[PDB]
Amino acid sequence: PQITLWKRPLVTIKIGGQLKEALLDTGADDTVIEEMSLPGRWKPKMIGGIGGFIKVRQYDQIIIEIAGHKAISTVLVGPTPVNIIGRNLLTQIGATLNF
Amino acid sequence: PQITLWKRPLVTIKIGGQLKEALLDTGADDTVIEEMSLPGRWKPKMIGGIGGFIKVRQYDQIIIEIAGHKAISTVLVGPTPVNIIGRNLLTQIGATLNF
Ligand SMILES: CC(C)(C)NC(=O)[C@@H]1CN(Cc2cccnc2)CCN1C[C@@H](O)C[C@@H](Cc1ccccc1)C(=O)N[C@H]1c2ccccc2C[C@H]1O
Ligand SMILES: [Cl-]
């Protein structure tokens, strides 16, 4: 699709076998999902936003589907106020910002 | 142009007559610029991101140029880590997210 930006560019994702809504975020380097149970090994990380930092669980090689695109990438899980799809996955689905 | 997302989507902006670099951010509702001297009336506001909220100066009806595209909009100024161009201005220059 070509997504206009009058509202938040939200898409449906599947992660850990669960359907969720997430924000396509060109300003985010990484993909960060709200606190959930996810199976697998992980390692701690801290990531920085506009209001400071949060601690997350970094999961490598996680299967995730984004607006029907089947992907495999690193997914961070932590106390983000919104599910965020960042550049690591925007690149996998071939997204571009056009003007 | 059409900007891929292998790298941060950084562009040159002009604000207050001064050239700066900024991030085109579809995940940002608003536009927030690092602390700078900008003429004009303003009022305080809070904006929230990962990590919490920050207090900024809200300037209404500010002229700004984004990668050669002029626009007039609300611009926030405060202790943001990076200059961010949000949806309020992305929509004004006709930007879309495509995949
Ligand atoms: C990987 C991670 C997600 C942590 N990235 C960010 O938070 C980066 C941080 N940098 C900075 C950075 C910090 C440290 C290291 N490298 C980079 C600045 C830009 N953000 C990207 C933003 O797009 C993220 C969104 C998330 C969000 C959306 C809706 C509601 C809550 C949170 C964001 O912060 N948006 C907020 C926002 C932003 C600007 C203006 C107004 C508003 C309101 C709101 O839309
Ligand atoms: Cl859960």
Swiss-Prot record, chains A, B:
The organism's place on the tree of life at top rank: Viruses
Region (Dimerization of protease): 1-5, 49-55, 88-99
Peptidase A2 domain segment(s): 20-89
Active site: 25
Subunit structure: Homodimer, whose active site consists of two apposed aspartic acid residues.
Function: Aspartyl protease that mediates proteolytic cleavages of Gag and Gag-Pol polyproteins during or shortly after the release of the virion from the plasma membrane. Cleavages take place as an ordered, step-wise cascade to yield mature proteins. This process is called maturation. Displays maximal activity during the budding process just prior to particle release from the cell. Also cleaves Nef and Vif, probably concomitantly with viral structural proteins on maturation of virus particles. Hydrolyzes host EIF4GI and PABP1 in order to shut off the capped cellular mRNA translation.
Protein name (database record): Protease
Organism listed in the record: Human immunodeficiency virus type 1 group M subtype B (isolate BH5) (HIV-1)
Gene: gag-pol
